[PDB]
Subunit: 159 residues, 6 copies
């Protein structure tokens, strides 16, 4: 069984993230979608909310397991028996941070291979930050989010 | 009459911004310089201050109208009857965010065309953030700002 | 009454070029789609072929005029009384050359303003170069080309 | 039971290529190291030489198969029943072309997924092109090549 | 005597910074390692702590002088009689800000030459921010920091 | 007593090259402006012409020595007892190649340190390649070249 971890903040999980995790399940036997607590990022949704949103948004994928973590991601990968670490690669500015993170993860866990997947052109220009910014200004974001996530984001912004 | 909107935070408006809006007035019949409230950016100047500074700095341009907005920029463009959205293109890191914003604006208002203009080499390495940083350290920023803006920034930093 | 030029080699014209010129026709009164006559790289299609293909592919656009040129693009723009130079922006790599080109064009003809337009996400990762390479190597490129161009390309590759 | 292809010109195969293919063998059951037969740029080593060098340099990797191909890389991947396309990512400049290539490969063969692997920091700033240029100009490239490749390159440059 | 200044936040000083300052001492007669107060960056270590850490980490280099400053860096360079300003160049995103800062420093002090040095491949993917992030999650950062700095960072994070 | 080399093809030498070499003469005792003898791309000007043009264009700089070389740039630097390798940095695209070159140069000659200098904003968007292309296509390039170079280029293009 090949086990992969897909770590991130997922605040909230978007269609771009669903695209990446779907591609990951077609390649690896079991995919752990790992949601980092990320308090330094001051996330809009609590970790508990982000885990529930991602569980509902990925329920149609049989080999996905959603978990939350506050640990060092290399230790969390070791502890999940993962040998692959998935990250989505969108644009140039993303790539620079991704290489730093992957070279650091390789220093911490050399047998964990970081692999990058490319999203559909459809989701190549969106991010959780951009979708939240549009939603804060009451713009329509239905196209970019799973149904349950769109509902939660609308509810969150209605106080 | 071709109507263009030039939206931004303009905290404060610099000579780089004047360069872009001047190029825009030579191309389009009416240019709306639209100042976003941008509270998430914690701006140095209030929206009212930024609007007054830009009005004074662009008074020599007959087809410029300065307005403030807190709305979604695509809705503000529709409501101003604008069919062109101008953004200045300075460097690579700017370009990435610009493509995300323009593809999002196109999703929200397909008939609004985002156009990018390139500033003079003179203003190609400055930004409102960089000018404020130098000014905070008492460095001379007279070369980068309209006279009224330089005065307001000096006064702001003198408590 | 704005006159704009949209120069290039168009070897062959793709749906990405059709997207950019269509956007340009929505904002300027007259658009000259200018085909470079003697490119340094020996083109797949002769100038006669490139002009005929572009004419047929843009025939539905009332305010487009397809013209061949052999001079420096600024010299032709000046002779055509164009005040706007349309450039399509796809990704970071093109942007670097575009800055060099636009600053050089501003030195050569200051009265010509470069305007950067963004193509649909659909054509943001293609080029005439990539299309030709794929087609020469027996790949399906139908989706990226106007029908008349697809027919001419199949004919060229058959012989 | 995943079948992966790792295509390229490998002119000659370097330690950077050995690093990427080794990583690919740790995560996929079968890896085809696919050597492009007729590259547009006349290669330093003939296809026969490139295949023999890659075979000897990967002989210790039980699940690697070295094969030459002359078709479009997607057509070969389809015929080989590969569902994974390995690409090595070194720096920003390659990433731009990689995005264009991967979106084109997804259009040609949607059932083939591109996976991006990161080489060691040791090989992150090299290429077959730079190695050849340095060696042709009497520079030491021993560190960047498998021993058999170093021996063949010295022989080629002597005559 | 050629005098160079190497300014930065150094929160904390890493092996990447030691690499750059060592290269600088091999090139220039006297190197001032200048630690900016940087309150806007909300640094982990006080200026006094950062100066003591850097003094201890560079004690083996005879021509290095460590100082703290809150002044405009161009004025601090003039006041240190420096004619060279060193900055390390790691990646693309770093380069953009570096060109803005150097063109601003040139406007403020034209006789001060900004020079960029490239770190070892070993430190090309690390930063003070990344090392602090790993350390906050209890990951091993001994490889990236001088011994005294590693001890201080472990102590800082143990409350 | 620092000896620095500033290598390149200088085909022809431009004001951008004059800017970089002038900056290098202000910080190092002796600067060798090193002209590559047999570039892979057949140069517009022969080596004799390139050396004569660079000599006349730098004659006012007392500590510059113009020399032709045909070996690998590191082999020449070693033979000249240079410990500093001057490289001009214009934009992001060049930076990527510069990193590869500098890490390769450090592998070949560790005692040679690469130093990156930044040209004036005035020359930050030009290259010998762009200048030649513009001039060949009947564009005005007088502003970008030393007078002697402008005279030689007009003569070369006339015949
Ligand atoms: C995505 C990105 C970062 C995090 C924070 N973080 C956790 N472990 C880490 N290891 C190295 C660097 C950052 C780390 C979480 C999700
Ligand atoms: C410049 C940039 C951003 C803003 C904030 N903002 C407002 N409407 C928006 N629509 C999409 C994304 C951001 C938006 C304002 C000025
Ligand atoms: C498309 C491709 C190439 C050309 C050649 N060309 C014409 N004017 C130019 N100015 C600067 C550089 C190249 C130029 C034209 C169109
Ligand atoms: C390495 C180098 C070049 C090739 C030529 N080539 C094959 N399929 C392709 N698809 C798109 C573009 C080029 C392609 C193959 C391997
Ligand atoms: C590194 C980077 C920035 C600082 C803050 N700072 C101080 N003087 C400055 N001059 C121009 C711009 C920023 C400045 C400090 C260290
Ligand atoms: C300018 C342009 C090209 C050269 C050719 N060349 C010489 N040493 C080299 N090392 C690595 C790569 C190319 C090299 C030299 C100067």
């Amino acid at each position: 069984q090949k086990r992969a971890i897909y770590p991130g903040t997922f605040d909230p999980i978007t269609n771009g993230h669903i695209d990446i995790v779907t591609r990951a399940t077609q390649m690896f036997d079991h995919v752990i979608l790992a949601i980092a607590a990320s308090p330094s990022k001051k996330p809009m949704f609590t970790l508990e909310e982000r885990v529930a949103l991602a569980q509902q948004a990925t329920a149609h994928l049989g080999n996905v397991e959603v978990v939350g973590f506050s640990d060092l991601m290399a230790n969390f990968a070791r502890n999940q028996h993962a040998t692959v670490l998935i990250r989505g690669l969108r644009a140039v500015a993303d790539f620079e941070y991704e290489m730093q993170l992957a070279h650091m993860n390789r220093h911490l866990m050399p047998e964990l291979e970081s692999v990058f997947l490319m999203p559909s052109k459809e989701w190549s220009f969106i991010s959780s930050s951009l979708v939240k910014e549009v939603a804060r200004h009451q713009g329509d974001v239905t196209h970019f989010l799973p149904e349950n996530v769109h509902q939660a984001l609308m509810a969150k912004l209605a106080v």
